[PDB]
Amino acid sequence: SNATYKVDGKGTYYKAESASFTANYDIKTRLNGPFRSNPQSGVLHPGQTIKYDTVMKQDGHVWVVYTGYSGKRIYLPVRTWDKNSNTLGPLWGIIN
Ligand code: NA
């Protein structure tokens, strides 16, 4: 897997990707990195749209990363990911 991703020191796969994401559920966002155990930043509600710059795979999900007003980095899970099969669940929103 991950021929066109890189991998960081926590084993998170990442690559640059510029697009928007419109949520279709209340999706919890995280501070610090793409782990559900991290401190919560907040939520996207259905119909809210963010512009992201990086896609990551960690903690059972694909995540996208964007920047808050204050400059902080915010990590948003968008679908499930199975690492051993290299397959993805359905998106929880709309890309672009
Ligand atoms: Na992991």
If you measure from the C-alpha of residue 11 to the centroid of ligand 1, how many angstroms do you get, rounded to a whole number? 6
If you measure from the C-alpha of residue 93 to the centroid of ligand 1, how many angstroms do you get, rounded to a whole number? 23
The structural domains of the chain, with segments of one domain joined by +, span: 1-96
Helix H segments across 1-96?
Answer: none
If you measure from the C-alpha of residue 59 to the centroid of ligand 1, how many angstroms do you get, rounded to a whole number? 5
Contact yes or no for 65/73 (Cβ under 8 A): yes
Instruction: Give the closest residue to 77 by CA, choosing from 40, 69, 85.
Output: 40
Contact yes or no for 26/18 (Cβ under 8 A): no
Contacts of 49 (CB under 8 A, 6+ apart): 20, 21, 22, 23
Q: To what resolution in angstroms was this structure determined?
A: 0.8
If you measure from the C-alpha of residue 60 to the centroid of ligand 1, how many angstroms do you get, rounded to a whole number? 7
What CA–CA distance (Å, rounded) separates 73 from 34?
A: 10
Q: Which two tokens stand for residue 55?
A: 């896609």
